[PDB]
Write a protein that holds these residues in place. Structure first.
Motif, mmCIF file in Angstrom:
data_model
loop_
_atom_site.group_PDB
_atom_site.id
_atom_site.type_symbol
_atom_site.label_atom_id
_atom_site.label_comp_id
_atom_site.label_asym_id
_atom_site.label_seq_id
_atom_site.Cartn_x
_atom_site.Cartn_y
_atom_site.Cartn_z
ATOM 1 N N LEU A 284 7.460 -3.795 14.921
ATOM 2 C CA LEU A 284 7.961 -2.872 13.929
ATOM 3 C C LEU A 284 7.365 -2.919 12.506
ATOM 4 C CD1 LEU A 284 10.479 -0.665 13.705
ATOM 5 C CD2 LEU A 284 11.618 -2.649 13.047
ATOM 6 N N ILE A 285 7.184 -4.167 11.905
ATOM 7 C CA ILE A 285 6.493 -4.472 10.620
ATOM 8 C C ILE A 285 5.067 -4.038 10.537
ATOM 9 C CG2 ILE A 285 5.846 -6.181 8.775
ATOM 10 C CD1 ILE A 285 8.493 -7.604 9.343
ATOM 11 N N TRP A 286 4.215 -4.247 11.627
ATOM 12 C CA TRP A 286 2.871 -3.614 11.728
ATOM 13 C C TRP A 286 2.840 -2.111 11.610
ATOM 14 C CZ3 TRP A 286 -1.553 -5.919 11.335
ATOM 15 C CH2 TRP A 286 -2.715 -5.333 11.853
ATOM 16 N N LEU A 287 3.817 -1.462 12.160
ATOM 17 C CA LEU A 287 4.158 -0.051 11.973
ATOM 18 C C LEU A 287 4.555 0.293 10.556
ATOM 19 C CD1 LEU A 287 5.444 0.743 15.627
ATOM 20 C CD2 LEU A 287 3.100 1.175 14.848
ATOM 21 N N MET A 288 5.344 -0.549 9.866
ATOM 22 C CA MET A 288 5.612 -0.341 8.454
ATOM 23 C C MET A 288 4.489 -0.553 7.508
ATOM 24 S SD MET A 288 8.661 0.816 8.887
ATOM 25 C CE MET A 288 9.655 0.462 10.327
ATOM 26 N N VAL A 289 3.516 -1.416 7.834
ATOM 27 C CA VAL A 289 2.226 -1.531 7.064
ATOM 28 C C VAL A 289 1.302 -0.227 7.193
ATOM 29 C CG1 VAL A 289 0.246 -2.997 6.544
ATOM 30 C CG2 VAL A 289 2.429 -4.013 6.964
ATOM 31 N N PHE A 290 0.948 0.121 8.456
ATOM 32 C CA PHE A 290 -0.077 1.116 8.649
ATOM 33 C C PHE A 290 0.311 2.528 8.977
ATOM 34 C CE2 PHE A 290 -2.720 -2.874 9.038
ATOM 35 C CZ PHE A 290 -3.561 -2.595 7.903
ATOM 36 N N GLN A 291 1.630 2.804 9.308
ATOM 37 C CA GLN A 291 1.954 4.079 9.959
ATOM 38 C C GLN A 291 3.168 4.788 9.414
ATOM 39 O OE1 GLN A 291 -1.360 4.207 11.514
ATOM 40 N NE2 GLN A 291 -0.013 5.457 12.825
ATOM 41 N N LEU A 292 4.148 4.028 8.867
ATOM 42 C CA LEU A 292 5.393 4.601 8.520
ATOM 43 C C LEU A 292 5.598 4.630 7.028
ATOM 44 C CD1 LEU A 292 7.210 3.066 11.659
ATOM 45 C CD2 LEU A 292 6.949 5.505 11.278
ATOM 46 N N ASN B 228 11.860 -0.104 3.855
ATOM 47 C CA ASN B 228 10.699 -0.691 4.510
ATOM 48 C C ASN B 228 10.727 -2.165 4.286
ATOM 49 O OD1 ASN B 228 9.557 1.688 5.466
ATOM 50 N ND2 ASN B 228 7.586 1.301 4.573
ATOM 51 N N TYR B 229 11.010 -2.603 3.090
ATOM 52 C CA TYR B 229 11.127 -3.979 2.650
ATOM 53 C C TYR B 229 12.347 -4.683 3.172
ATOM 54 C CZ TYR B 229 7.377 -2.146 -0.428
ATOM 55 O OH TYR B 229 6.359 -1.342 -0.915
ATOM 56 N N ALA B 230 13.454 -3.882 3.362
ATOM 57 C CA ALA B 230 14.704 -4.321 4.122
ATOM 58 C C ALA B 230 14.436 -4.749 5.543
ATOM 59 C CB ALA B 230 15.816 -3.306 4.004
ATOM 60 N N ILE B 231 13.657 -3.946 6.287
ATOM 61 C CA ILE B 231 13.317 -4.298 7.627
ATOM 62 C C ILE B 231 12.429 -5.594 7.637
ATOM 63 C CG2 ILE B 231 11.839 -3.601 9.636
ATOM 64 C CD1 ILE B 231 12.844 -0.589 8.394
ATOM 65 N N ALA B 232 11.530 -5.676 6.599
ATOM 66 C CA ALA B 232 10.721 -6.821 6.381
ATOM 67 C C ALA B 232 11.538 -8.085 6.117
ATOM 68 C CB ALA B 232 9.632 -6.588 5.333
ATOM 69 N N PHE B 233 12.609 -7.897 5.360
ATOM 70 C CA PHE B 233 13.499 -8.983 4.996
ATOM 71 C C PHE B 233 14.298 -9.623 6.190
ATOM 72 C CE2 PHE B 233 18.020 -9.940 3.135
ATOM 73 C CZ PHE B 233 17.705 -11.278 2.764
#
Length: 50
Positions: free
Chosen positions: A16-24, A29-34
């Motif tokens: 999911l985080i790779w998707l938040m870096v390059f695609q979404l 975004n940072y919440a999901i990262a957290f």
């Protein structure tokens, strides 16, 4: 296994985080990262001192 399931949630999160870096926005975004920070730490506290 409780650790194996946990690990799998953490990979699923990294996937999911790779998707938040390059695609979404940002604060979501940072919440999901957290949450993968919580999962990262969770796995360390599975195990304990003898």
């Amino acid at each position: 296994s409780v650790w194996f399931v946990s690990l799998f949630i953490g990979l699923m999160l990294i996937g999911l985080i790779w998707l938040m870096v390059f695609q979404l926005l940002g604060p979501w975004n940072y919440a999901i990262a957290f949450a993968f920070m919580i999962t990262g730490l969770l796995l360390t506290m599975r195990w304990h001192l003898e």
